[PDB]
Design a protein around this ligand. Structure first.
Ligand SMILES: *[C@@H]1O[C@H](CO)[C@@H](O)[C@H](O)[C@H]1NC(C)=O
Ligand SMILES: *[C@@H]1O[C@H](CO)[C@@H](O)[C@H](O)[C@H]1NC(C)=O
Ligand SMILES: *[C@@H]1O[C@H](CO)[C@@H](O)[C@H](O)[C@H]1NC(C)=O
Ligand SMILES: *[C@@H]1O[C@H](CO)[C@@H](O)[C@H](O)[C@H]1NC(C)=O
Ligand SMILES: *[C@@H]1O[C@H](CO)[C@@H](O)[C@H](O)[C@H]1NC(C)=O
Lengths: 49, 238, 99
């Protein structure tokens, strides 16, 4: 009797389970505002986190 | 004002978020040495690695905390106020008044004025004879905070064991070399204590339910070190 | 016109795009990823009593054997898929060829 090799059951598929998505950064209001004042006086806001 | 007392077996918190059942995990982290020497206050206090703040403050008198470099409107600071419905954590600057007492007419009591505020996190009040224990830790700018509420009746600083849960891990990183307390309004019943954590080694005991029920310091006395070496709570003759 | 500068610099980013997910399959060998916990095995239903801040679970030898799913907060066991050795039984090739 000879011990030759090994033996395994292969995986079927793949799964990814990142948590719920929320706290979407605000970007529509910048695009959907109907006015940007002027090019010499523009509105800016910092978006982060 | 300062009267001192021993620390007994207090100030143990969950080191990580891993669930273990009926094991004995030997942990290496910053902790409060057993039978230490705390200062009972009846001020200027530095911040080297973390503190154990245990204000019983029976009704409501003590509230508020200031952390940072200069504790003024010059360098970034921190605030924590939890009254009855909301708690605020402002990371902006505030010059300091003469006393850390709240005016209760809106803000001029504890601090001077406001400026250029930034990220704010809110939550439910941290409150849920009324013992309150907190541990503050700032490592690589996550500002770990731990807490445990035991309004049960004991002594002014009794014995007993209670593990401390985590509470929040705010993404911060301001410089916190010094801090100072706050209150609302010296000869008052401002019963609270301080004490610095220390890099040590412990032996925490978990139960199948998942909660720490006992622990043993590994540098107190020879028997404790023997227990840690054997990784057990019992030792046979030898 | 708007200038949406995507500055990425020494300060931590903390501003990244979203991440989608897939379904949960139980009682089947599979690969998985739970917020960055790679590994393969069979996911079943467990009767453990996590405290409401504990994510993993570990044995006496530090092998992950429990996970709390992010979307739905329940407990799943983890058992690695089957493996073992293989031996071949033969008579002499001078005799026969069956095994
Ligand atoms: C604490 O420090 C004081 C001196 O500050 C010392 O007399 C005392 O033995 C120390 N330990 C305890 C338990 O009070
Ligand atoms: C933090 O502020 C203190 C003064 O409050 C200062 O001595 C120290 O150099 C600053 N930086 C660090 C890294 O502690
Ligand atoms: C606690 O303080 C905040 C801000 O000072 C206030 O909005 C809130 O109403 C206070 N809580 C109660 C119960 O009044
Ligand atoms: C607050 O921060 C802003 C921007 O960093 C700065 O212009 C201002 O001088 C600071 N102080 C006050 C009192 O606003
Ligand atoms: C953990 O929870 C189970 C189920 O309620 C309970 O039977 C057990 O006593 C608990 N463990 C304790 C209280 O140490």
């Amino acid at each position: 009797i000879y011990q030759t090799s090994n033996f395994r059951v292969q995986p079927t598929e793949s799964i990814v389970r990142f948590p719920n998505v929320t706290n979407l950064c605000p970007f529509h209001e910048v695009f959907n505002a109907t006015r940007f004042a002027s090019v010499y006086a523009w509105n800016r806001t910092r978006i982060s986190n | 004002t300062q009267s001192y007392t021993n620390s007994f077996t207090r100030g143990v918190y969950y080191p990580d978020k891993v669930f273990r059942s009926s094991v004995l995990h030997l942990t290496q982290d910053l902790f409060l040495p057993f039978f230490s020497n705390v200062t009972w206050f009846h001020p200027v206090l530095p911040f080297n690695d973390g503190v154990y703040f245990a204000s019983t403050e029976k009704s409501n008198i003590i509230r508020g905390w200031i952390f940072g470099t200069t504790l003024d409107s010059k360098t970034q600071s921190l605030l924590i106020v939890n009254n009855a419905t909301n708690v605020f954590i402002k990371v902006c600057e505030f010059q300091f008044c003469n006393d850390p007492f709240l005016d209760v007419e809106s803000e001029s009591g504890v601090y001077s004025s406001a400026n250029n505020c930034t990220f704010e996190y809110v939550s439910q009040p941290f409150l849920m004879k009324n013992l309150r224990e907190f541990v503050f830790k700032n490592i690589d700018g996550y500002f770990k905070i731990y807490s445990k509420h035991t309004p049960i009746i004991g002594r002014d600083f009794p014995q007993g064991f209670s593990a401390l849960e985590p509470l929040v891990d705010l993404p911060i990183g301001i410089n916190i070399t010094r801090f100072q307390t706050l209150l609302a309004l010296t000869a008052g019943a401002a019963d609270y204590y301080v004490g610095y954590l220390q890099p040590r080694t412990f032996l925490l005991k978990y139960n199948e339910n998942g909660t720490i029920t006992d622990a043993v310091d590994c540098a107190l006395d020879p028997l404790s070190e023997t227990k840690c070496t054997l990784k057990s709570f019992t030792v046979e003759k030898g | 016109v708007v200038v949406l500068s995507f500055e990425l610099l020494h300060a931590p980013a903390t501003v990244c795009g979203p991440k989608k997910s897939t379904n949960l399959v139980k009682n089947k060998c599979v690969n998985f990823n739970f917020n960055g916990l790679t590994g393969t095995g069979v996911l079943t239903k467990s009767n453990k009593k996590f405290l409401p801040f504990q994510q993993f679970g570990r044995d006496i030898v530090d092998t992950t054997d429990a996970v709390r799913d992010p979307q739905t907060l329940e407990i799943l066991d983890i058992t690695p898929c089957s493996f073992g050795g293989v031996s071949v039984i033969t008579p002499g090739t001078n005799t026969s060829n069956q095994v």
